[PDB]
Design a binder for these strands. Structure first.
Ligand SMILES: [Mg+2]
Lengths: 434, 429
RNA sequence: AAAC
């Protein structure tokens, strides 16, 4: 006996609740408007002209081969309401360690020498650099300076020009060039201090936390694993806290866990950020991870959490398949259907067919996320609604929704960035990682 | 009077018309466009232009340049313009770059462009509207959102209409779970995984569903077995949770039954005429080419061709007891001539991610169900050997779920668009 | 290193 959750509605400008972020962006515009986008460019002169060509392309609307599953791109100013010109482009010419060293040197020298501030920076990477080597290393080295950066290749904006020995392009964007421009524009607008959208049907004073763990291969200790956390209220603009590098991973068990001397630190960082950003303490806190926590971590979390806060710990897993199949039709079970295994364990179908797109987010068959309230006491349907909402807030890709909630989607990427550089200490919003 | 009539090419320019129209009702205008109603007609359209319409617009694109509908709209709008002596009653909205000069309708060339950007065009249109005394309401995006949900998302809703899992129930279990003890400890080099029957070395005991005489002829002659020290637990209360002793706890009972079921399945797949595959975690179990009738079973294909490789739809299994079910995970394992497995796993994964496309709900469901029926002993059951007399009965029909909402099943050509486009995209990946 |  399945249960269905009405798809979460997200606000856009003018206080209007839509469901597809692209539809709302093209209809009401971004929820928070920015006056404009000042962009910075670092790369070769050919990279500069490729980037200029791609903005000329972005100004004009670009279309998808399917405009229902991937709505068309109205053009940057049409959807966002802020201009991204080529006159606002600051360029510094460039003629694995050494390459990222020069690129970072140019970025820092620009951020210091230039009088006019730049909203976002965009880095053009030649194809030879991609083939012979970067994103994690460079984007980590820029975490100290709080520089929001977006990396694009020569073959991403000028894919038509780059062709193989057979004459065909290396990678074809013809059917989703509009979608590619959609995603690039949404990323650039997010990194420019603008919040494209936020959840609408959400209770006040609720926080969502996601722990991430990444092992270090170069470490002599095979057990070592860095930790991190990601925090979201409803905005989808999450604050990321770096953890402590050390013996985190459980090798024989295969799990990741925190000693109580760092779980306190991480959750206290999360709660102090909440208090700074809200001036009150949350009524509920939900912590998300790929694994169940031991009682050590939960008790460490409970000591630092205030009494009036109903702290809840919920784990999200791509566990052994409960792959539901609709009896008739090649159309899978719709996204948003949930199975109440028990008051603390449920399945959430964040992938699959969605009626709004008349399309499927998942490729083969939607593997549901098994969500488990391993710790704490909370109503299971509310947790499923919260995770369904959190699936919508991936600003790095302009898509209807994400299979993994944003509290855990970028775990691998943020871990790679954090462990890319070992001699760097960082306080930061999610826009400095995606 | 007060309306703002937009005329356009319906099939080809509906993107821009949608965008402009919805933006204009957002700004409080009383906009009238051919796409803003359901179950619509020329008597009504002409009525609005003659009396209700205060401003009229056309979309001067190449596709809509010569259209009978839009041209007749232009004609009636010209009549209303002559009646109302308005110099800019009809407004071109040129959105097409390829539309060259002196190629537009003659009534239009002599008269706002969106070629560079729809935002600039919308701003030009808005200032042109403001220069004239265009009646409007205070900006109300709520009604624009209501129209967007009522018109453009009417066919994209969810029906309140009333699913086949991969979870196959276990109707019956062997009544007793037995632990065997021997006078001499079994050798450390003696692997219980080599035992012909499922057996888990739990503490010094051997956990089974079976009896003593099953492995009497494979145990080493240096091991002497005693029938007194074997301890049995009632399985019904193992599921019911009523069992409570210090020697073994319920949380361990269910987990022990889990690995017992897993090993029973793995050993059953030796007498089920199924070949094996090494993956990261467990054993994959696939059907060999040349064995199954035309690579089909109950008219569902299970083995097929992919370039010079051959794909075999294999499965893996894992039990659970929360309701006692078994999950089957579906894998696709390739061989190079139907016989020899691919040595390197990277090509295996790349080829699997290539193959998984073109397969959807019905295809995956039918393939998994066909493999399960091929693995059945009885028509409506699967027998796993755990003991010489004890059998584990797992119904070969997966669990059924009573839903309450679903979608209007759309045209399958939309899913074919999905298949082709996403196939190309994953090739790019 | 558009992106899942
Ligand atoms: Mg990104």
């Amino acid at each position: 006996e399945l249960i269905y959750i009405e798809e979460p509605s997200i606000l856009f400008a003018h206080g209007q609740k839509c469901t597809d972020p692209r539809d709302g962006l093209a209809l009401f515009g971004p929820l928070n408007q920015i006056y404009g986008i000042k962009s910075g460019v670092v790369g070769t002169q050919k990279g500069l002209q490729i980037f200029k060509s791609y903005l000329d392309k972005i100004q004009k609307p670009i279309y998808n081969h399917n405009n229902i599953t991937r709505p068309m791109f109205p053009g940057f100013e049409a959807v966002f309401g802020c201009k991204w010109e080529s006159q606002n482009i600051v360029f510094k010419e460039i003629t694995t360690y050494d390459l990222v060293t020069l690129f970072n040197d140019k970025i820092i020298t620009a951020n210091k020498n230039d009088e006019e501030r730049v909203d976002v920076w965009f880095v053009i990477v030649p194809e030879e650099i991609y083939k012979y080597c970067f994103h994690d290393q460079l984007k980590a080295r820029l975490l100290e300076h709080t520089i929001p950066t977006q990396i694009l290749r020569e073959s991403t904006l000028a894919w038509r020009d780059f062709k193989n020995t057979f004459g065909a392009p290396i990678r074809d964007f013809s059917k989703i060039e509009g979608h590619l421009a959609w995603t690039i524009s949404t990323a650039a607008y997010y990194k420019a201090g603008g919040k494209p959208w936020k959840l609408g049907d959400i209770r006040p004073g609720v926080c969502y936390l996601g722990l991430v763990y990444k092992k270090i291969e170069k470490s002599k200790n095979p057990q070592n694993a860095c930790c991190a956390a990601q925090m979201f209220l409803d905005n989808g603009d999450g604050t990321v806290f770096k953890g402590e590098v050390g013996p985190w991973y459980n090798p024989e068990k295969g799990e990741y866990h925190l000693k109580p001397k760092e779980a306190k630190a991480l959750l206290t960082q999360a709660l102090e950020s909440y208090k700074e950003q809200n001036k009150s303490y949350p009524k509920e806190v939900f912590i998300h991870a790929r694994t169940r926590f031991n009682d050590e971590e939960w008790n460490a979390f409970n000591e630092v959490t205030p009494k009036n806060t109903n702290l809840v710990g919920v784990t999200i897993t791509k566990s052994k398949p409960l792959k539901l199949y609709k009896t008739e039709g090649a159309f899978p079970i719709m996204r948003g259907n949930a199975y109440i295994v028990d008051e603390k364990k449920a399945f959430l179908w964040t992938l699959g067919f969605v009626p709004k797109l008349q399309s499927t987010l998942s490729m083969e068959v939607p593997n549901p996320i098994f969500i488990e309230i391993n710790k704490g006491e909370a109503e299971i349907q509310q947790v499923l609604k919260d995770i369904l909402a959190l699936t919508k807030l991936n600003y790095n890709a302009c898509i209807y929704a994400d299979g993994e909630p944003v509290t855990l989607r970028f775990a691998n990427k943020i871990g790679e960035i954090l462990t890319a550089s070992t001699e760097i200490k960082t306080p930061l919003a999610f826009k400095y990682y995606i | 009077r007060n309306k703002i009539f937009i005329s356009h090419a319906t099939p080809e320019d509906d993107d821009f018309t949608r965008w402009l129209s919805l933006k204009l009702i957002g700004l409080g205008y009383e906009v009238w466009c051919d796409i803003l109603f359901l179950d619509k007609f020329w008597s009504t359209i002409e009525k609005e232009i003659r009396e209700n319409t205060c401003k009229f617009l056309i979309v001067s694109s190449t596709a809509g340049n010569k259209r009978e509908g839009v041209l007749k709209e232009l004609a009636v709008a010209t009549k209303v313009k002559k009646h109302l002596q308005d110099d800019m009653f009809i407004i071109p909205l040129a959105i097409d770059e390829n539309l060259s000069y002196d190629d537009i309708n003659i009534e239009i060339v002599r008269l706002i462009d969106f070629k560079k950007s729809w935002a600039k065009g919308l701003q030009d249109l808005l200032d042109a509207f403001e220069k004239q005394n265009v009646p409007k309401k205070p900006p109300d995006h709520s009604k624009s959102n209501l129209l967007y949900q009522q018109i453009f998302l009417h066919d994209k809703q969810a029906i309140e209409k009333e699913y086949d899992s991969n979870w196959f129930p276990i109707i019956s279990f062997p009544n007793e779970l037995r632990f065997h003890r021997y006078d001499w400890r079994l050798p450390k080099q003696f692997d219980v995984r080599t035992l012909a029957f499922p057996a888990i070395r739990y503490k010094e005991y051997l956990c089974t569903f079976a009896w003593e005489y099953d492995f009497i002829h494979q145990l080493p002659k240096t091991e002497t077995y005693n029938g007194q020290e074997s301890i049995r637990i009632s399985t019904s209360d193992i599921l019911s949770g009523r069992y409570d002793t210090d020697f073994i706890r319920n949380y361990e009972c269910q987990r022990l039954i889990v690995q017992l079921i897993n090993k029973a399945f793995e050993l059953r797949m030796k007498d089920k005429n199924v070949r094996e595959y090494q993956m990261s975690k467990t054993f994959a179990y696939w059907i060999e080419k040349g064995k199954l009738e035309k690579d089909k079973f109950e008219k569902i294909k299970l083995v097929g061709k992919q370039k010079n490789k051959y794909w075999h739809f294999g499965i893996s299994a894992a039990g659970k007891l929360y309701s006692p079910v078994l999950m089957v995970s579906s894998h696709i394992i390739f061989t190079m001539d139907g016989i020899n497995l691919i040595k390197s796993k990277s090509i295996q994964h790349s080829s699997r991610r290539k193959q998984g496309k073109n397969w959807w709900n019905d295809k995956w469901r039918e393939k998994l169900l066909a493999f399960i029926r091929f693995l059945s002993d009885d028509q409506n059951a699967i027998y796993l050997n755990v003991g010489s007399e004890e059998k584990i009965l797992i119904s070969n029909k997966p669990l059924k779920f009573f839903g309450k909402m679903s979608y209007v099943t759309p045209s399958e050509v939309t899913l074919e668009e999905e298949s082709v486009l996403a196939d190309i995209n994953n090739f790019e990946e």
